[PDB]
Design a binder for this molecule. Structure first.
Ligand SMILES: CCCCCCCCCCCCCCCCCC(=O)OC[C@H](COP(=O)([O-])OCC(O)COP(=O)([O-])OC[C@@H](COC(=O)CCCCCCCCCCCCCCCCC)OC(=O)CCCCCCCCCCCCCCCCC)OC(=O)CCCCCCCCCCCCCCCCC
Ligand SMILES: CCCCCCCCCCCCCCCCCC(=O)OC[C@H](COP(=O)([O-])OCC(O)COP(=O)([O-])OC[C@@H](COC(=O)CCCCCCCCCCCCCCCCC)OC(=O)CCCCCCCCCCCCCCCCC)OC(=O)CCCCCCCCCCCCCCCCC
Ligand SMILES: CCCCCCCCCCCCCCCCCC(=O)OC[C@H](COP(=O)([O-])OCC[N+](C)(C)C)OC(=O)CCCCCCCCCCCCCCCCC
Ligand SMILES: CCCCCCCCCCCCCCCCCC(=O)OC[C@H](COP(=O)([O-])OCC[N+](C)(C)C)OC(=O)CCCCCCCCCCCCCCCCC
Ligand SMILES: CCCCCCCC/C=C\CCCCCCCC(=O)OC[C@H](COP(=O)(O)OCCN)OC(=O)CCCCCCC/C=C\CCCCCCCC
Ligand SMILES: COC1=C(OC)C(=O)C(CC=C(C)C)=C(C)C1=O
Ligand code: SF4
Ligand code: F3S
Ligand code: FES
Ligand SMILES: [K+]
Lengths: 164, 86, 69, 259, 82, 158, 48
């Protein structure tokens, strides 16, 4: 990164830990939380990487950086699946029509049984890839699949733990 | 589906009763401020006979009565205009 | 009727405070000021699809197709 | 001879839902609406489907929409008149069959608030009940009687629009019940989690939740108190607190949880 | 309608699919850019706007009050309206 | 009774002094065309037709007669008003198109909520920009008054 | 083989309370003010 600012290892540790908990604490399910925050997170993450490059092997800073990277990876991956679920549910809502009447109704997803098989596979892939972020995966993608289940009757492993 | 006690119909009558009075007053105040300015800039002045009035005007302003097209815009409105106006 | 000086600081400052106070209050204090955020959050947020046709995309697309890009 | 129009949907035919009119003699029927529905099922049309257990208003299973306003059929009274009594499922809910709604989202949202007492120190051996004064117990009076009927939920215009993001009146009142329980020691954690634009501040004070509550509770008042407490007690470090609790739930099973 | 069935979902922060969340972030930037540009309207009004009755005002100051120190005898009735 | 609308005194002077016709520029033409019509329940304000007449006359730029100077000042104030009307249409067009493209993937409700307000805001912004670039913000109170004097006035006998 | 139904908008039938109509009049307050300004602007431009 192009910068002339210099930071101590203590300052570098503080910045990295602040960003890690900020990301892990923010509610990922609300889209506006990620849309508004990610621009600020990306600017900070670039600065954190530059100042923590010497301390990648450090016993304290190193683990923080590794967790921070993993959290950002999980944040982007989970947001992608829930974005597609939101697309499916909004296609379904538009199909209901104006006022629910069906008056000016859009055409209704035809491969919905198959689009629900795609999402559930993605959900399970996230669970395996990010084993230490299940609480966040369930907050975003898990709950998203529970909403879809109310529209289409499909089977996924955690369906019973979502009251289905 | 449709009911009189519905949230839609009761929120549409409530809004009308609540806002239409406020609005009528608000627009009226603007209309009143408009009249106050208009009556101070060109107050409508009523003349008895249009033909006599037109003559006094042409005489007072030094305008040739032949070059002025007088037209009746409405039952209670006449209008003198320049006939040689670009 | 012919004072040597006229005191204007008090009156002008009073008007400044009143005008500034009303404008700053309206812009900062009321929660109504976030009414446009609430309406958008309630009815507009998380209600979008890329798999549904809309006129602006159709218009841009046809006009491009017409001009051979 | 009252007329009862009832919403009907077959999950298999998947034909457009319709209102079917039945005629019942109130002389041979119980005063409550649920009695009329049972009589219709027993005599005329046994296909009619509806949830009912307690018959006394306590289970919270007979929540329906009667003549426009949500309520429990077992506590609702039949009001005879020329106008047919219209009975429909809970508003803006997915209908599994006839008058049986789909309240799975409501159950999931409740599991999210983690409604179980949390303490930093495990009960020491040889310890009796955790101390609570009568006055402290009085604070939890109007909040612990909620039967989860879900009427207040399906009466909020804000839950109609954003069901999957707004926790809803009932869940929010239950969250205040655990934020107000002197014995709970995770007050700050609960307030930090609930302090979200979508979860809490989607309540615009319509007051439909309090008007339709069958148990006479006031979910609207509780949400107002919870918003005032959060605003006064907010600190910059709350976000970190939420993150740390999320790390503590890392090994939890697959279901809604604090995160 | 129908929907694509072979979507390659994002796997990490450096292998990302273009979705409507990223489009929404571009919208945030573009709307915020408009706000920066529209600030030039109110700022330009305050800078370029002059409240003067005629061209006389400046001539009066050049010939009677050049230093902005000359003191005028005050006749209250003039501007008091009475 | 009967009313009589006659050319105002400013109109009389402008007609006496006009030396020739004056070419209307392209922006003046468009500005007049894009100007909303005015319904004269009572006559107190200038409309697009009166403004054209003012702009179609020509006056001697050197003439030192005080009367001619008033006419030229008025014609300049009318010109700034007319060319300022060219900014409303650009504003309203961009005030609908840009928001609509941005919300093109969102539901109908969102376009109904947003587009009407952005349209008025864009039109207002365009009007501000047009009046600003037409030098209306630097006009004196004497210039603006002379440009707003009515062209038709009810006759007052005696 | 089985599918659930989605009930129509509740606005058309749900009973209206006086606190719910008045809460709307509050959320629509700024919308009316803009409307009135537009009317006055239009009148100042197309009338008298
Ligand atoms: C009539 C003329 C106006 C017509 C409308 C003009 C519209 C164009 C405006 C252009 C300027 C920029 C506007 C904001 C851009 C976005 C900024 C942003 O993203 O910030 C986070 C933004 C909120 O910003 P915030 O600054 O943190 O909080 C705002 C609060 O005001 C708290 O902020 P505060 O503490 O600084 O409080 C100051 C408050 C002070 O508040 C006021 O001035 C009071 C009036 C408030 C209500 C006014 C509108 C009433 C009509 C209905 C409004 C709702 C419908 C939509 C309206 C247009 C929205 C653009 O000022 C504001 O509200 C913020 C300034 C801009 C307001 C623009 C809209 C209203 C202009 C009204 C002017 C005339 C009002 C007259 C009222 C009557 C009496 C005279 O949140 C969201 O983006 C939520 C989105 C939810 C849905 C998903 C949308 C997609 C998500 C991806 C990004 C999208 C970006 C674009 C969003 C808008 C799309 C239409
Ligand atoms: C904030 C604004 C504060 C007020 C600003 C203001 O008025 O400044 C005046 C101030 C005074 O100017 P001035 O020297 O007196 O010149 C007059 C205007 O500048 C000359 O005005 P202009 O011509 O430049 O602009 C007129 C103005 C106003 O537009 C008009 O004049 C429209 C006229 C429409 C006439 C329609 C007639 C329809 C007749 C139908 C008949 C049907 C008959 C059916 C019969 C059936 C029989 C069976 O136009 C616009 O603003 C653009 C068009 C409207 C766009 C927005 C439309 C949607 C508004 C939605 C509002 C929210 C609603 C609720 C949503 C929820 O203007 C300025 O200083 C410069 C301009 C910028 C001002 C800002
Ligand atoms: C140190 C102590 C500080 C105390 C601060 C107190 C602040 C609060 C009190 C108000 C101060 C500001 C008053 C307004 C500005 C001064 C007056 C002014 O400009 O008018 C004279 C101007 C003077 O113009 P003029 O051209 O007529 O003056 C010539 C007068 N003659 C003919 C007699 C010579 O008035 C007008 O032009 C007429 C219209 C006046 C319209 C006033 C509208 C309301 C203004 C107040 C709004 C308050 C909003 C917030 C409160 C809630 C409102 C509902
Ligand atoms: C927000 C600011 C918006 C300003 C818009 C108008 C600016 C303007 O007119 O500029 C010229 C004027 C100077 O006026 P002027 O008199 O030289 O020219 C203005 C011309 N007329 C009179 C025709 C309009 O300056 C300002 O008004 C802006 C002053 C800004 C001072 C800010 C100080 C900040 C201190 C921070 C300390 C941090 C610790
Ligand atoms: C608080 C604004 C923050 C920025 C908001 C986003 C920016 C884009 C929207 C516009 C913001 C405000 C711009 C203000 C500057 C433009 C004002 C303007 O053109 O006023 C028109 C005109 C100026 O008159 P002139 O004498 O020609 O010029 C002054 C110098 N002699 O003013 C008026 O006519 C005032 C009308 C007030 C009507 C009542 C109040 C309306 C609200
Ligand atoms: C059934 O279709 C409709 C919605 O979906 C639930 C709405 O969100 C809303 C609420 C939001 C707006 C802006 C109309 C209504 C009224 C509507 O008709
Ligand atoms: S608050 Fe009232 S209506 Fe809501 S679940 Fe509890 S008892 Fe039922
Ligand atoms: S009706 Fe809904 S908006 Fe709040 S006051 Fe009750 S939960
Ligand atoms: S049957 Fe239990 S609440 Fe009515
Ligand atoms: K507690």
């Amino acid at each position: 990164m192009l910068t002339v600012d210099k930071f101590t290892r203590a300052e570098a540790l503080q910045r990295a830990s602040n960003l890690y908990y900020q990301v892990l604490g923010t509610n990922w399910e609300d889209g506006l939380n990620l849309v508004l925050d990610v621009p600020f997170w990306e600017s900070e993450l670039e600065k954190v990487d530059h100042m923590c490059e010497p301390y990648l092997c450090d016993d304290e800073i190193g683990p923080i950086i590794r967790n921070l990277h993993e959290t950002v990876n999980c944040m982007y991956a989970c947001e992608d699946v829930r974005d597609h679920i939101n697309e499916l549910l909004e296609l379904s809502s538009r199909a209901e029509g104006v006022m629910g009447s069906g008056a000016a109704a859009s055409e209704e997803v035809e491969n919905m049984p198959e689009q629900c098989g795609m999402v559930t596979k993605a959900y399970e892939d996230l669970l395996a890839r990010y084993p230490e972020h299940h609480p966040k995966i369930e907050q975003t993608v898990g709950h998203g699949l529970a909403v879809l289940r109310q529209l289409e009757k499909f089977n996924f492993k955690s369906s019973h733990r979502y009251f289905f | 589906m449709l009911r009189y006690d519905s949230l839609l119909w009761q929120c549409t009558l409530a809004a009308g009763i609540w806002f239409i009075p406020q609005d009528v007053a608000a627009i009226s105040a603007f209309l009143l401020y408009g009249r106050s300015k208009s009556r101070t800039i060109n107050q409508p002045v009523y003349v008895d006979n249009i033909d006599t009035a037109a003559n006094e005007y042409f005489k007072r302003k030094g305008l040739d009565p032949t070059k002025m097209i007088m037209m009746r815009k409405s039952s209670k409105i006449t209008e003198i205009r320049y006939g040689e106006m670009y | 009727n012919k004072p040597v000086v006229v005191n204007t600081s008090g009156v002008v400052n009073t008007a400044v405070l009143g005008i500034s106070g009303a404008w700053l209050y309206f812009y900062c204090v009321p929660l109504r000021r976030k009414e446009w955020y609430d309406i958008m959050m309630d009815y507009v947020h998380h209600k979008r699809t890329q798999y549904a046709s809309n006129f602006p995309d159709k218009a841009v697309r046809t006009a491009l197709r017409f001009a051979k890009v | 001879m009252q007329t009862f129009r009832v919403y009907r949907y077959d999950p298999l035919l998947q034909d457009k839902p319709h209102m079917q009119e039945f005629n019942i003699d109130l002389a041979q029927c119980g005063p409550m609406i649920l009695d009329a529905l049972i009589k219709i099922k027993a005599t005329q049309d046994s296909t009619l489907a509806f949830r009912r257990s307690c018959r006394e208003g306590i289970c919270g299973s007979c929540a329906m929409n009667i003549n426009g306003k949500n309520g429990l059929a077992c506590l609702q009274y039949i009001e005879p008149g020329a106008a047919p009594i219209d009975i429909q499922p809970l508003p803006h809910t997915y209908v599994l069959k006839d008058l049986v709604p789909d309240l799975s989202n409501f159950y999931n949202q409740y599991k999210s608030i983690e409604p179980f007492l949390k303490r930093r120190r495990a009960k020491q051996p040889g310890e009796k009940e955790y101390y609570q004064s009568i006055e402290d117990r009085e604070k939890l009076d109007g909040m612990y009687e909620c039967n989860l009927c879900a009427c207040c939920m399906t009466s909020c215009p804000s839950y109609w629009w954003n069901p999957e993001y707004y926790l809803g009146p009932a869940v929010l009142l239950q969250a205040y019940r655990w934020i107000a329980d002197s014995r709970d020691e995770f007050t700050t954690e609960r307030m930090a989690w609930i302090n979200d634009s979508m979860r809490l501040y989607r309540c615009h004070g319509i007051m439909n939740c309090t008007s339709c509550c069958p148990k006479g509770l006031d979910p609207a008042k509780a949400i107002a108190k919870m918003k005032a407490a959060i605003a006064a007690a907010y600190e910059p470090g709350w976000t970190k607190i939420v993150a740390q609790e999320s790390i503590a739930n890392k090994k939890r099973e697959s279901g809604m949880m604090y995160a | 309608a129908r929907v694509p069935e072979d979507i390659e979902f994002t796997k990490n922060r450096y292998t990302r699919r273009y979705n409507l969340a990223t489009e929404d972030r571009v919208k945030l930037l573009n709307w915020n850019a408009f706000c920066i540009a529209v600030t030039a309207l109110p700022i330009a009004y305050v800078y370029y706007s002059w409240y003067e009755s005629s061209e006389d005002t400046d001539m009066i100051y050049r010939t009677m009050d050049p230093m902005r120190e000359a003191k005028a005898d005050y006749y209250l009735p003039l501007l008091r309206g009475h | 009774a009967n009313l009589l609308l006659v050319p105002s005194d400013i109109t009389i002077i402008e007609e006496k002094n006009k030396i020739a016709k004056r070419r209307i520029r392209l922006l003046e033409k468009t500005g007049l065309a894009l100007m909303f019509p005015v319904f004269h329940w009572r006559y107190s304000k200038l409309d697009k037709h009166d403004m054209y007449n003012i702009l179609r006359r020509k006056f001697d730029p050197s003439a030192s007669d005080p009367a001619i100077d008033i006419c030229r000042r008025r014609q300049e104030s009318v010109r700034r008003r007319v060319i300022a009307q060219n900014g409303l249409l650009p504003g309203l067009l961009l005030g609908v198109s840009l928001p609509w493209w941005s919300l093109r993937r969102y539901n109908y409700q969102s376009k109904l909520i947003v587009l009407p307000f952005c349209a008025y805001f864009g039109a207002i912004c365009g009007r501000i920009a047009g009046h600003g670039l037409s030098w209306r913000w630097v006009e004196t109170d004497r210039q603006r008054m002379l440009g707003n004097l009515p062209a038709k006035v009810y006759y007052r006998p005696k | 083989s089985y599918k659930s139904a989605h009930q129509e908008t509740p606005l058309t039938y749900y009973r209206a309370t006086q606190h719910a109509t008045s809460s709307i009049n509050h959320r629509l307050a700024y919308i009316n003010a803009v409307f009135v300004i537009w009317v006055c602007d239009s009148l100042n431009d197309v009338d008298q």
